[PDB]
Chains A and B, each alone.
With several copies, the nearest count.
Chain A
Amino acid sequence: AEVYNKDGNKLDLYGKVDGLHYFSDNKDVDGDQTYMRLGFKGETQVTDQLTGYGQWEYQIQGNSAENENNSWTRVAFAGLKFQDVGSFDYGRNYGVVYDVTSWTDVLPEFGGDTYGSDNFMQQRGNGFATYRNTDFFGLVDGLNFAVQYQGKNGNPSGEGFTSGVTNNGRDALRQNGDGVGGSITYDYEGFGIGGAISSSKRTDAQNTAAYIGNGDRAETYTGGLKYDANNIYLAAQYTQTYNATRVGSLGWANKAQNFEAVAQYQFDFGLRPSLAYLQSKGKNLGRGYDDEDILKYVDVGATYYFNKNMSTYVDYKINLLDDNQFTRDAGINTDNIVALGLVYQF
């Protein structure tokens, strides 16, 4: 909702409450999953060509008792945009690989989980410096590219570490050395085609015997396709990764091949059914694991839109992973899940 628009400054205050419940034989995901998100997007006109902006988004879980608080910052960044040249922003933001993979992250509840948060340059993460050029100086409609740098996020401070520390340090599964990446997308009418590449130094804390997938750098290569017209949405992405994909709590995959596909239709009366397939196939994993499925599921669901502010959905994760030693060791969910959600948003 735009709550302020005066003398060239605009402020949009937005959010949602998702009354949400999971049904699953897996009791670690089963039960109340209610949550809310809040955010703001602000923009200020500096000149006719130059605009400054900032965005912040926060998630607060609504499913805990009052003696605890489970909340986090999704994004927080400030930036400058110049008409027909580009933009730059810095902060917690999305990695440029997400420019392509976001195209299949459109499912009612699940999806978008061949990668995670704080996972090199694949999704949300800290310390992104992002440069973007839209429409190639305004001379090629629909063509966009981006180049991104990520600074090191290392070991926690004040915990007796003698190397690799940063002020905002964290556990090794969520660390990263310096990284660089890029994306190109082209959209003509309904069609879209895109590609992205990322390369991040891996830290010493990540390259210990306690984690599978030791390596100097984490690399990702992504291609994507999209069709979005005539009430039909189709998209697919394929990603090859090296020492970049987490294998639950075990560490990372030496190599992984990720694939996601989605098909959706929008009825006039407000119903939007969705069908999707995701898989992540790991190779040469180490410790005798050899080749294993990290993720494999079919997602069938539907959303009903009452209007732009109220909707309800059901999403059914038909989980094709089988319960074995590998998935047990990594703590990967192999059970089906049904989600039922009712969402108010502004």
Chain B
Amino acid sequence: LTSQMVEYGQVKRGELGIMGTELNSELAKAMKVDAQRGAFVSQVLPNSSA
């Protein structure tokens, strides 16, 4: 991780740009999600690839 900061300015880690959490969150219930066993998408980040 350290060499990357040196030779690039930052570490090359790509993001899927989604933001969210588990299927227990108040929003997974307050929005009633069918088939719960995965990642809940609370929001898709702006100008992102997602």
Q: Is B36 part of the contact surface with A, judged by Cβ < 8 Å?
A: no
Q: Is A8 part of the contact surface with B, judged by Cβ < 8 Å?
A: no
Q: Is B24 part of the contact surface with A, judged by Cβ < 8 Å?
A: yes
Determine the residue in chain A with the shortest Cβ distance to B30: A158
Determine the residue in chain A with the shortest Cβ distance to B31: A158
Q: Is B29 part of the contact surface with A, judged by Cβ < 8 Å?
A: yes
Q: Is B7 part of the contact surface with A, judged by Cβ < 8 Å?
A: no
Residues in B with CB closer than 8 Å to A162 are 29
Interface set, chain A 141-158, CB cutoff 8 A to B: 157-158
Interface set, chain B 25-39, CB cutoff 8 A to A: 25-27, 29-30
Residues in B with CB closer than 8 Å to A160 are 24, 26, 29
Dominant SS among interface residues on chain A: loop
| A157, A158, A159, A162 interface centre (most CB from chain B within 10 Å) | A158
Number of interface residues of A (CB under 8 A): 5
Determine the residue in chain A with the shortest Cβ distance to B26: A158
Determine the residue in chain B with the shortest Cβ distance to A167: B26
Residues in A with CB closer than 8 Å to B29 are 160, 162
| B25, B26, B27, B30 interface centre (most CB from chain A within 10 Å) | B26
Least CB distance, A96 to chain B, in whole angstroms: 32
Least CB distance, A50 to chain B, in whole angstroms: 36
Determine the residue in chain A with the shortest Cβ distance to B25: A158
Residues in B with CB closer than 8 Å to A158 are 25-27, 30
Interface set, chain B 1-31, CB cutoff 8 A to A: 24-27, 29-30
Residues in A with CB closer than 8 Å to B30 are 158
Least CB distance, A43 to chain B, in whole angstroms: 34
Chain A 97-127 per-residue mask, 1 if CB under 8 angstroms from chain B, else 0: 0000000000000000000000000000000
Least CB distance, A156 to chain B, in whole angstroms: 9
Determine the residue in chain A with the shortest Cβ distance to B24: A160
Residues in A with CB closer than 8 Å to B25 are 158
Least CB distance, B36 to chain A, in whole angstroms: 13
Least CB distance, B29 to chain A, in whole angstroms: 7
Least CB distance, B21 to chain A, in whole angstroms: 11
Interface set, chain A 235-259, CB cutoff 8 A to B: none
Residues in A with CB closer than 8 Å to B27 are 158
Determine the residue in chain A with the shortest Cβ distance to B27: A158
Interface set, chain A 279-305, CB cutoff 8 A to B: none
Residues in B with CB closer than 8 Å to A157 are 26
| A159, A160, A162 interface centre (most CB from chain B within 10 Å) | A160
Least CB distance, B30 to chain A, in whole angstroms: 7
Chain A 149-180 per-residue mask, 1 if CB under 8 angstroms from chain B, else 0: 00000000111101000000000000000000
Determine the residue in chain B with the shortest Cβ distance to A162: B29
Determine the residue in chain B with the shortest Cβ distance to A159: B26
Q: What are 10 pairs between A and B in contact, CB < 8 Å?
A: A157-B26, A158-B25, A158-B26, A158-B27, A158-B30, A159-B26, A160-B24, A160-B26, A160-B29, A162-B29
Beyond contacts A157-B26, A160-B26, A162-B29: 5 other A-B pairs, Cβ-Cβ < 8 A, are: A158-B25, A158-B26, A158-B30, A159-B26, A160-B24
> Contact residues of B with A, CB < 8 Å?
24-27, 29-30
> Contact residues of A with B, CB < 8 Å?
157-160, 162
A-B complex: 5 closest residue pairs judged by Cβ atoms: A158-B26, A157-B26, A160-B29, A158-B30, A158-B25
